[PDB]
Each structure stands twice: as C-alpha cells, then as structure tokens.
Amino acid sequence: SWGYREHNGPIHWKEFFPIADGDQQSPIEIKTKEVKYDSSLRPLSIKYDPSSAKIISNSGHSFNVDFDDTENKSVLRGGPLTGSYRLRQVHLHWGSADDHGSEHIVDGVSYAAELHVVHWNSDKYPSFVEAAHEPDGLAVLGVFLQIGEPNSQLQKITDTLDSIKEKGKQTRFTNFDLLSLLPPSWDYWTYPGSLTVPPLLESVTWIVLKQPINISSQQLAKFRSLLCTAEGEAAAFLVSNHRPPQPLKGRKVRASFH
Ligand SMILES: NS(=O)(=O)c1c(F)c(F)c(S(=O)(=O)CCc2ccccc2)c(NCc2ccccc2)c1F
Ligand SMILES: [Zn+2]
Numbered sequence: 001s002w003g004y005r006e007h008n009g010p011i012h013w014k015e016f017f018p019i020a021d022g023d024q025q026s027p028i029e030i031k032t033k034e035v036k037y038d039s040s041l042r043p044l045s046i047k048y049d050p051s052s053a054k055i056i057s058n059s060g061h062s063f064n065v066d067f068d069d070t071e072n073k074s075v076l077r078g079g080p081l082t083g084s085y086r087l088r089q090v091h092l093h094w095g096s097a098d099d100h101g102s103e104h105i106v107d108g109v110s111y112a113a114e115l116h117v118v119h120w121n122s123d124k125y126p127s128f129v130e131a132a133h134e135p136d137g138l139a140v141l142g143v144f145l146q147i148g149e150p151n152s153q154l155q156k157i158t159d160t161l162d163s164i165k166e167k168g169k170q171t172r173f174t175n176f177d178l179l180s181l182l183p184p185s186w187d188y189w190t191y192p193g194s195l196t197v198p199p200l201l202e203s204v205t206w207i208v209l210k211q212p213i214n215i216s217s218q219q220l221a222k223f224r225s226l227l228c229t230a231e232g233e234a235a236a237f238l239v240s241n242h243r244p245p246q247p248l249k250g251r252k253v254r255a256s257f258h
Contacts, residue, residue, distance in 0.1 A: 002197075003060070003061065004061070004228075004238070004241050004242075005228075005236070010243045010244060013198055013200065016198065017198045019194070019199070019201065019202065020200050022200070023202075023249045023250070023251075024192050024193050024194055024202040024249075024251065025193060025194045025200065025202070025246035025247075026103070026104075026193030026194045026196050026204065026206060026243075026246065027105075027114075027142075027193070027196050027206075027243060027244075027246070028104060028191065028193065028245050028246060028247075028248055029104075029245045029248075030104060030105070030106045030189050030208070030253050031253075032106065032255075033107075034253070035189060035252075035253045035254065035255045036252070037254075037255050037256075037257065037258035038255065038256070041079055041080055041190070041254070041256050042078045042079060043078050043079075044076075044077075044079040044186050044188070044207070045076070045077040045078035045079075046076055046179065046182070046186075047073075047074065047077075048074045048179050049073040050176050050177055050178070051073070051174060051175060052067045052068050052071070052073050052074040052087060053066075053067055053173050053174045053175070053176035053178070054066055054067060054068050054172075054173065054174060055171065055173055056157070056164060056170065056171055056173035057164060057168070057171075058165065058166065058168065058169050058170075058226055059091075059167070060167035060168070060227075060228045060229070060230075060238070061091075061197060061228065061238070061241055062091035062092055062093065062226075062238070063091060063092065063157065063160075063161070063164060064089050064090070065089060065090045065091070065173055065176060066088070066089050067087045067088060067089065069087070069120075069122075069128060072084060072086060072122070074087035074178075075087065075119070076119045076139055079188070079256065080207065080254070081139055081205060082136065083121060083123035083124065084122065084123050085119035085120055085121055085138075085139040086120055086121075086122040086128075087118075087119050088118045088119060088120055088128050089117075090115065090116065090117050090118070090178060091115075091116055091118075092113055092114070092115050092116075092145075092223060093113060093114045093116070093196070093241050093242040093243075094112065094220055094223055094224065094240065094241065094242065095112070095113075095242055096224070096239040096240040098112045098217055098220060099112070100112075101113045101114070101220075101240070101242055102144055102145075103196050103242050103243055104142055104144075104208050104245065106210075111144035111145055111146050111212055112145050112146060112147050112215060112220055113144075113145040113215060113220055113223075114143070114144055114145065115142070115143040115144075115145060115181065115213075116140050116141070116142055116196075117140065117141040117178065118138065119139045119141075120132070120138050120139075121134070121136055121137055121138070124136070124137075125137055131203070132195070132201050132203050133203060135202065135203055136203075136205065137203040137204075138203045138204040138205070139204065139205045139206075139207060140204050140205075140206055140207065141182075141188075141207050141209065142206060142207065142208040142209065143181065143182060143183065143213055144209070144211075144212035144213070145212060145213055145215040145220070146213070146215070147214075147216065147217055147220070148214035148216070149214055149216065150214070150215070150216035150219055151214045151215050151216070153180045154215060154219055156177075158222050160173065161222055161223070161226060164226070165225070165226060165227055166227050166229065166230055166231040167227060167229055167230040167233075168230050168231075169231075182209070182213070183209060183211035183212065183213045185209075185210070185211045186209055186211075187209070187210045187211065187255075187256050187257035188207045188209050188210060188255070188256045188257075189206075189207075189208045189253050189254065189255050189256070190205065190206060190207050190208070190253070190254050190255075191206050191251055191252070191253040191254065192204075192206075193206050193251075196242075196243045223238075224238065224239045225237065226238045
C-alpha cells in the first residue's frame with residue numbers, strides 16, 4: 001500500500017523497501033558542468049511498432065500502457081546498451097502543480113511531467129520480472145514534458161482516461177504511435193540507477209533525453225483526475241506521483257553529445 005500521500009509517500013518508502021536509501025537510486029539531479037561527453041556511446045536505435053501496444057490501465061500510481069513483450073518488434077538498442085532491450089511499458093509522472101513534477105532535475109530545472117519508456121534485456125533474461133532484479137536488466141528512456149502548446153500525440157492517451165478512472169481499470173490500447181511522443185533530438189544523459197517506485201530495484205540503465213516535449217496545462221490536469229483508489233472505495237486523486245531526486249553517491253553521469 002505504498003503511494004504518494006502523506007502517510008505512504010516517498011519519505012516512508014524506506015520503511016518497507018530498505019534499498020530506498022541505496023547507492024544507485026533514482027531519480028537524480030544532473031549537474032551538466034560535471035557531465036562528460038562519451039564518444040564510445042553508439043547511436044541510439046529505436047525501432048517501435050504501434051501494433052505492439054496492447055492495453056492501458058490505471059495501476060493506482062500512474063497509467064501504464066503495456067506492450068506485447070515476447071516479440072522483438074519494438075526494441076531499444078545502441079546508446080549505452082549491450083544487446084537488445086524489449087519495450088515493456090510506458091507511464092507518466094507529474095506533480096500537483098505545473099511548475100514541478102518531473103523526477104529528474106537538470107541544473108535545478110524541474111519540468112511539468114516526465115514520461116518513462118521501460119525496456120528489458122531479453123537477450124539475457126527470461127522475463128521482465130527476472131530482468132528487474134539484475135544490474136543490466138532494465139533500460140528506461142526518460143522524456144521531459146514542459147508546459148507549452150497542446151500536444152496532439154497525447155490524444156490517444158487522454159481520450160482513455162475517463163475509462164480508466166479507478167485503480168485496476170483497463171482498456172484496449174493498440175496502434176499507438178510512441179515514436180512521435182519523443183522529441184526531435186535524442187541527445188541524452190545516461191547513468192546507472194533504479195526503479196523510481198517500490199520495489200526500487202537497482203537494475204536500470206537510465207537514458208534521459210535532454211530536449212523536452214510539450215504538454216498544455218489543460219492536458220496535464222486530466223492526469224490528475226485519475227484515482228489512486230479502486231471502485232467502491234472512498235475516492236482519492238492521483239494529483240502527484242513523482243519521487244524526489246536521490247543523491248548520486250559517487251556515480252557519474254555521461255552525455256551522448258558535446
Ligand atoms: N519510474 S520507472 O520508470 O522506474 C518504473 C519502471 F521502470 C517500472 F518497470 C514500473 S512497473 O509497473 O513495471 C512495476 C515495477 C516493478 C518491477 C519489477 C517487479 C515488481 C514491480 C513502474 N511502475 C508502474 C507500476 C507501479 C505499481 C504497480 C503497477 C505498475 C515504474 F514506475
Ligand atoms: Zn517512472
């Protein structure tokens with residue numbers, strides 16, 4: 001029963017998930033003056049098939065778009081990764097107001113929201129759930145969202161939100177154009193970290209894109225009408241679902257670009 005309310009939110013997660021105070025926790029603050037370009041990163045390769053998307057659901061902590069994950073039709077390769085990481089899921093973090101809501105923060109700048117694209121190493125591991133317990137098991141792309149003119153590529157998502165208002169609701173979601181949610185430039189920072197939700201496993205290679213995409217205020221507010229509660233339960237709203245940055249504790253952040 002972890003969440004982002006007073007009693008169950010990020011400050012208390014260490015109570016049930018001791019790795020919360022680990023050495024490779026996410027998200028982080030990126031201090032660009034201390035980041036080093038790395039010419040050894042390969043081009044990032046994103047191959048995504050809209051037909052791989054299957055369902056969207058309200059997990060109680062965000063919406064999750066889940067992808068068919070026994071095929072290599074949608075994979076992330078290149079960059080800092082060895083081998084092929086299979087697309088598993090997309091979800092979004094925001095705050096209760098537009099001025100902050102991202103998980104990563106760049107030279108003290110906090111965007112309105114942050115989209116995460118979760119992939120796992122099917123070249124080494126038998127399932128997403130196994131790969132989540134391995135250091136090179138997961139790769140997550142982060143995209144920032146900044147308040148600006150509305151983004152038409154969010155429509156397929158926002159159109160489904162009334163249907164998944166309560167925790168545990170789901171609805172069919174295919175032919176999703178994920179590629180078009182990414183910004184035009186894919187320059188990124190990368191570092192070793194963790195899931196930003198319980199169980200907070202340290203199995204993620206983060207790839208955080210420098211260029212934000214837009215969202216309007218009116219679009220972002222729709223996400224905050226989702227509930228963190230199930231049907232028949234006193235309603236509570238998911239107005240904020242972002243973890244604060246954790247300390248780098250010795251890790252260094254690399255950049256794809258100079
Ligand atoms: N913030 S994040 O991008 O790190 C991330 C993930 F990488 C991730 F894989 C997930 S998850 O839905 O696949 C659940 C995490 C997990 C992984 C392996 C074993 C157990 C749990 C969520 N979170 C969305 C979510 C949270 C809770 C319940 C259902 C979905 C998630 F938020
Ligand atoms: Zn996330």
